[PDB]
C-alpha cells in the first residue's frame, strides 16, 4: 500500500488514480467505498 503519493491503484476492481491519505470517516462494516456529492469515489477500504 503506497500512501501519501500520487499512484495508480486497483482496489478489488475499483481502478483509479490519486493520492491516498488515510481518511478518518465512519464506514459501516459492510460499506466498501465512499462517494462524494458528485458521485465520484472519494474514499475506499483496504481489502487487507
Amino acid at each position: 500500500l503506497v500512501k501519501n503519493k500520487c499512484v495508480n491503484f486497483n482496489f478489488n476492481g475499483l481502478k483509479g488514480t490519486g493520492v491516498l491519505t488515510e481518511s478518518n470517516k465512519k464506514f459501516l462494516p459492510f460499506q466498501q467505498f465512499g462517494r462524494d456529492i458528485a458521485d465520484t469515489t472519494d474514499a475506499v477500504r483496504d481489502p487487507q
Binding site: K25, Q31, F33, G34, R35, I37
Partner: peptide, 23 residues
C-alpha cells in the same frame, strides 16, 4: 389479518458510503 406497513422495509441499496446527502 392485515396491517399497515408504515415506513418499514427500507434497506441499503448498495455498499457505497454516502455522507449527509439525499440520494
Amino acid at each position: 389479518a392485515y396491517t399497515n406497513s408504515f415506513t418499514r422495509g427500507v434497506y441499503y441499496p448498495d455498499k457505497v458510503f454516502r455522507s449527509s446527502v439525499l440520494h
